[PDB]
Amino acid sequence: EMEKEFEQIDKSGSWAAIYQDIRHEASDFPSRVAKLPKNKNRNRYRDVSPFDHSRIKLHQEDNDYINASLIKMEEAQRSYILTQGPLPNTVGHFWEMVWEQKSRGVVMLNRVMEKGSLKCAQYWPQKEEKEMIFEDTNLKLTLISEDIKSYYTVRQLELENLTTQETREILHFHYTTWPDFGVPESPASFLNFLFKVRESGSLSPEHGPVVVHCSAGIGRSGTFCLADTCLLLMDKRKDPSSVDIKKVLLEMRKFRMGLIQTADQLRFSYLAVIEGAKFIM
Numbered sequence: 001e002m003e004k005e006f007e008q009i010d011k012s013g014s015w016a017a018i019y020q021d022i023r024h025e026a027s028d029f030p031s032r033v034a035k036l037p038k039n040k041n042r043n044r045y046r047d048v049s050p051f052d053h054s055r056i057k058l059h060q061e062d063n064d065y066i067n068a069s070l071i072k073m074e075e076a077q078r079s080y081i082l083t084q085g086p087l088p089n090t091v092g093h094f095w096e097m098v099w100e101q102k103s104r105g106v107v108m109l110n111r112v113m114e115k116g117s118l119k120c121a122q123y124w125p126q127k128e129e130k131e132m133i134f135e136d137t138n139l140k141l142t143l144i145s146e147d148i149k150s151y152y153t154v155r156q157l158e159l160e161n162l163t164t165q166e167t168r169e170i171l172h173f174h175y176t177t178w179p180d181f182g183v184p185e186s187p188a189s190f191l192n193f194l195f196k197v198r199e200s201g202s203l204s205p206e207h208g209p210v211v212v213h214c215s216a217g218i219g220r221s222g223t224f225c226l227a228d229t230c231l232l233l234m235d236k237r238k239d240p241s242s243v244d245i246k247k248v249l250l251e252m253r254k255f256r257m258g259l260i261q262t263a264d265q266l267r268f269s270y271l272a273v274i275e276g277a278k279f280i281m
């Protein structure tokens, strides 16, 4: 059981060592399409690339590339699209992917500005009356409503296909309080946020996979998916303590490189799941 394994690693301070064994054991697959010169300006970090095998393809004939990965957790019956914070020139692509994958929810785990730099383009409207048109992808986006709370904001948006006049309602879940450095002291607000996404039905198989991002779509995004999948497997299994968070992380890393960027994020994920197990036990 992980609670005991938690104290063990913690008491021994072996987090950096566990973390290194995961780095070593992690899968490595081609990312040939990411590295093509015509895609250079579609990537935010040159060292954060989708594997070819699990990359999301845009349905435009021109260039089908977006820095986005489908993570399929077969046993948990859960899929996630992990992507980078959109660039000024990829906001249109981002909303096209959301449209084409029939996603209900977008989960955002960064602020637009952190440490005095831009981590992300402003890809959603700030006022009801000021909608955004994406000329390249023929999509209109409108803010319908916005519910600002202490730790997070939920924003009801209408995505309209200008080509076909279909509209869909998208939910934007924005965790607004992840600190600039390290990880939250308590996982309580993060778990509350995860349960709010769950309740929305955005994680449900009725819908396309949820789109999850931070700046790179591997660190905070990783923690989100890892916690969701682990808690869900603990419901599904005859023996809940058979769930190995290191095994689960390694399965997710077959789909996108670098999920969980630091030993700090690894520790926080353990804490979140343990506290998660507790809330629902």
Ligand SMILES: COC(=O)c1cccc(NS(C)(=O)=O)c1
Pocket (backbone or CB within 6 Å): 145, 146, 147, 154, 155, 156, 196, 199, 200, 201
């Ligand atoms: C901003 O409006 C909302 O909060 C909203 C709108 C529509 C649906 C939901 N589902 S929920 C209460 O689980 O998050 C929320």
